[PDB]
Design a protein around this ligand. Structure first.
Ligand SMILES: Nc1ncnc2c1ncn2[C@@H]1O[C@H](COP(=O)(O)OP(=O)(O)O)[C@@H](O)[C@H]1O
Lengths: 250, 527, 61, 68
């Protein structure tokens, strides 16, 4: 979770809120041919820089049928601003709901786990990490270079509190986040592995100029997909840190 | 009558079977406040009998309860796309669904070309062990209309709610029967299920038994849903068709009797040194060859509408041409790379494909009497274990060519190889888990075979038992474990580089990582 | 490994060659990118490689 | 003319074989010979004769017809 910056509240959402104080998300989507629906979707996605919330995949710029809007708390939460997020398709939308588990990634796996677990309390706040409340710079998720599976870091988790909970159980919250959001599927692991591939490829020449170009291209500019993986790779590598702090000059 | 009835009548007047059958149902009931009149119902039935230009008859859905090894397997076969790959596993129940469809389809095949009503039900060994409420329910789908059918059984010592209906298929049989006797050229639905028993295909027992019927439309349903591509029927059809075009045959009979006389054998045995008689014997053998050559030359000249059927089997087997038989001791002759040779000595997979395509083509041409394009009919063909005897080159090509040679034919098949199951889109391939049906993940239409194996068949691309695989795993563990040169990376690298070779996209990456690690320990010396 | 005659495979080839040549961001680059992102998923091996390299060599320009 | 030759091995000591045919219009140019397989059979039969429980090799093929 690269964390986002929730902007100021927009007007047409409040206008639809006023007319029906008790309404569902489907009511907001169907009303007025969904013009306000796609307007709010564009607002949320522009806030988020067109990157997936928990999955961090390059959301399509042109086609808006590849982007879904979901709620941190299971679906008045249908209208609250502190609940709407934009997520990937999750590998679904080819079928409807009859798909093999253990491969779904972002949110459809969340619903599948909720249904097969029979979780009555849909309030996930305080149970898994919320991207809105996360700090700007968090260490948290580290991954081994062998399989690319993201794993919690005990050292950083033990020295921070999240979602108004004691810092002792923060590691448990991170593990629960991993378990619910299925952030270790084959596709994302392969994507992380090839991100490591392309970080490593430019380093064969040991050309510090091109390496500094890579650091400038990743760290600076608009955030890109798999930002967490890039940050972990940059911090883990000692030479990248030495180049960033000015120890090495070319 | 409401204006909707008038609109439906007007639509049905412009060649619409759906509207005709909807008005038939309305007249047979009290729908939309329409007075019950069987006269207009019969008129609508007669109008519909003249509107059967083609409906692409399908099987739509299936409902199984306590059959074989499944409990409840409501499944929706594709309708807009004419294919479905039932992937499953070995022992999960692929053949269960296909067997259910063929038991359902035997009743349909009977009610097309037979009289009375004959069909097969659930036997004693098919009922699930533990409960007795078995039922097969396949909902057919003609062009816009559906006919329910439930095949059910019940143990004598109990009475479940397994009320077998057979309610819908009677209407389909009736409408085809009425449509038959107005113009004896109709596109009857095709029915055929093909088990794995086609392995014992073309052999001498069928060709040698060659030594009539006019091939009516009602024939090709016969011996179709059995499970074997009977080459004997195809050979008989070939002979009957080409016979439409005696002294030589009488000469062959006389020469066989004369040259095989016991007196001639005794004379030959008595005088071994018979060079003068040996010359006459070789002259007789030359006459044998000349007569046989002339008799065969009276054949390989012309053909008939059989050419269209022949073109179907030259596409699936490249390099094959000039399929005739021999008027000498019976055999079928092909030509492979300018090498004429007999069919009995073809490859196993070649014979399998040849028999399969020939049988389907024969069925399709017998059902369709008079058409410019007889080979693209409407029907259902079921294939079990399509990858039985096929090379991987043909496995990724078998289905895309099958859907092209035969257009309006459903091809629900079962596969056991990734190469065949990566030419079909991900929404039309079905996976049978331990007890439930699951859909394939996206990215199968043109994906790599390794991905299909890994995320559709649950098998690792690297055998997780071999010594070399474990050595590679240990090497990949050690390279990233902060000891990239601790003498064991050295040993295992010296082993794996010699084994796999210095140029493979599994060790090149990891050696590049090792080189990067080597570079990483240069500027840190001063630290 | 991949189908020798398949429409999506041909689109993959027609995307890959244009990525490694002229028309890196033009008429057809975005449309084939979207078409091959709808299928195969937007997160696989080949397409992430191609997207990363196109980002690299559009940043260089 | 056609000919098939197979060499059978046992404990590093080899047995020759050749099976051939010729169409009955020309004088045969390849006569059959089974010198080594008679040897092997005689060896095994003698071993059985002196001791009834001597292990013998297994010869079998499984054709595709094992489907049914
Ligand atoms: N009386 C029964 N009770 C439970 N299961 C049965 C019974 N009879 C047959 N089966 C099941 O039928 C299965 C046979 O699999 P099958 O339908 O032939 O598909 P495939 O050959 O492709 O593996 C077996 O797994 C077996 O469990």
């Amino acid at each position: 979770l690269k964390r986002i910056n929730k902007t100021a509240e927009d007007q047409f959402l409040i206008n639809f809120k006023a007319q029906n104080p008790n309404g569902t998300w489907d009511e907001f989507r169907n009303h007025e041919q969904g013009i306000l629906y796609k307007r709010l979707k564009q607002h949320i996605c522009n806030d988020q820089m067109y990157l997936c919330a928990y999955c961090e995949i390059d959301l399509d710029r042109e086609n808006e049928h590849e982007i879904k809007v979901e709620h941190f708390k299971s679906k008045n939460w249908h209208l609250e601003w502190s609940n709407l997020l934009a997520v990937c398709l999750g590998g679904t939308n080819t079928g409807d709901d009859f798909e093999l588990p253990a491969n779904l990634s972002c949110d459809s796996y969340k619903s599948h786990y909720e249904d097969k677990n029979k979780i009555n309390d849909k309030d996930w706040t305080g149970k898994i990490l919320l991207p809105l409340t996360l700090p700007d710079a968090h260490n948290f998720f580290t991954f081994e270079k062998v399989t690319g599976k993201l794993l919690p870091n005990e050292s950083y988790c033990n020295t921070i509190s999240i979602d108004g909970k004691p810092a002792a159980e923060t590691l448990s919250i991170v593990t629960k986040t991993i378990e619910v959001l299925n952030l270790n599927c084959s596709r994302l692991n392969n994507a992380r592995r090839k991100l490591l591939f392309h970080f490593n490829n430019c380093a064969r020449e040991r050309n510090l100029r091109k390496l500094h170009n890579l650091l400038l291209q990743w760290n600076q500019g608009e955030p890109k997909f798999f930002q967490t993986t890039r940050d972990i790779i940059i911090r883990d590598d000692r030479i990248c840190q030495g180049l960033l702090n000015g120890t090495i000059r070319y | 009558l409401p204006s909707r009835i008038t609109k439906l009548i007007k639509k049905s007047e412009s060649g619409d079977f759906a509207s005709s059958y909807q008005l038939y149902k309305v007249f047979g009931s009290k729908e939309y406040g329409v007075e019950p009149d069987e006269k207009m119902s019969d008129y609508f039935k007669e109008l519909s009998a003249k509107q059967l230009e083609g409906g692409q008859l399908r099987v739509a859905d299936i409902h199984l309860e306590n059959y074989k090894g499944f409990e409840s397997l409501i499944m929706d076969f594709s309708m807009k796309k004419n294919s479905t790959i039932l992937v499953g596993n070995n022992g999960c129940g692929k053949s269960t669904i296909l067997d259910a469809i063929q038991k359902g389809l035997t009743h349909l095949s009977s009610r097309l070309s037979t009289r009375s009503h004959n069909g097969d039900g659930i036997e004693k060994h098919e009922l699930r062990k533990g409960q007795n409420y078995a039922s097969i329910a396949i909902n057919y789908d003609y062009m816009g209309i559906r006919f329910p059918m439930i095949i059910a059984t019940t143990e004598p010592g109990y009475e479940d709610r397994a009320k077998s209906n057979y309610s819908g298929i009677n209407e389909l049989g009736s409408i085809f029967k009425t449509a038959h006797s107005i113009n004896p050229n109709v596109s009857f639905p095709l029915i055929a299920m093909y088990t794995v028993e086609r392995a014992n295909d073309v052999s001498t027992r069928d060709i040698e038994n060659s030594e009539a019927q006019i091939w009516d439309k009602f024939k090709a349903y016969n011996k179709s849903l059995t499970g074997k591509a009977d080459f004997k029927l195809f050979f008989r059809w070939f002979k009957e068709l080409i016979e439409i075009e005696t002294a030589l045959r009488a000469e062959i009979r006389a020469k066989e009797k004369d040259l095989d006389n016991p007196l001639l054998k005794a004379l030959l045995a008595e005088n071994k040194n018979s060079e003068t008689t040996k010359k006459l014997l070789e002259d007789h053998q030359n006459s044998l060859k000349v007569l046989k050559e002339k008799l065969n030359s009276y054949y390989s000249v012309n053909s008939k509408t059989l050419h269209t059927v022949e073109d179907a089997m030259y596409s699936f087997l490249p390099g094959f041409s000039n399929l005739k038989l021999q008027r000498a001791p019976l055999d079928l002759i092909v030509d492979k790379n300018n090498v004429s040779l007999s069919v009995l000595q073809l490859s196993q997979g070649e014979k399998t494909i040849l028999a399969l395509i020939a049988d389907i083509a024969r069925r399709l041409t017998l059902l369709n009497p008079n058409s410019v394009n007889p080979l693209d009919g409407t029907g259902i063909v079921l294939i079990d274990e399509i990858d039985l005897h096929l090379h991987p080159s043909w496995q990724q090509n078998i289905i895309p060519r099958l859907e092209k040679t035969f257009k309006n034919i459903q091809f629900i098949v079962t596969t056991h190889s990734p190469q065949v199951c990566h030419t079909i889109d991900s929404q039309n391939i079905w996976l049978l888990k331990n007890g439930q049906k699951f859909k394939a993940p996206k990215g199968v239409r043109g994906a790599i075979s390794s991905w299909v194996l890994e995320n559709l068949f649950e098998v690792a691309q690297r055998p997780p038992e071999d010594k070399y695989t474990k050595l590679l795993q240990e090497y990949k563990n050690l390279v990233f474990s902060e000891k990239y040169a601790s003498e064991d990376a050295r040993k295992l690298g010296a082993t794996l580089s010699q084994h796999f070779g210095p140029d493979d996209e599994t060790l090149v990456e990891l050696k590049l990582e090792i080189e990067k690690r080597i570079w990483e320990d240069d500027f840190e010396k001063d630290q």
